[PDB]
């Protein structure tokens, strides 16, 4: 039975209790997210940012099934193009607003990767994707104000491919935190 997250607390205590099993109900919990109210005083810990880069700052790590994050992104600041390693990736929007540009799959053939759809995530919204879905690259693209965003992964994932747009060609790279449980994490 799916409940009003009255905190970030909560909420974590919700979601341990959705994913208590061994497969995912992506609707309960996209339902679940967006119902939490952001608070900045609940997450201001874990808002970690970096001049240069977005920064993922890591929250809870689940019960074995998934992980919670936080990542922070500075004006400017955006993604490669890239998938999510056969995991489930929720996004809610903590603070500000931040662009998601879809694409599919490249064939094998060397190609431009053209964009399938954009769209504007606004505050405290939650979007979902996985690689049947297709690919996608986020970005703030705000010139004025900072973004933050509450994903939660299942299973938890430490690598992902990122995508040359100018060809489809892919590259792995192993995702770091930039801080764990509000420690930063050089
Ligand atoms: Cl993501
Ligand atoms: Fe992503």
Known sequence: ELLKPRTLADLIRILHELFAGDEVNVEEVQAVLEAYESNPAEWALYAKFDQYRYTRNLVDQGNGKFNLMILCWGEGHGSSIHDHTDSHAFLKLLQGN?????????????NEMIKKSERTLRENQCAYINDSIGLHRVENVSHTEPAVSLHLYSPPFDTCHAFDQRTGHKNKVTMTFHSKFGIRTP
């Open 98 to 110: 931040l662009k998601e540009t879809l694409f599919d799959w490249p064939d094998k053939k060397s």
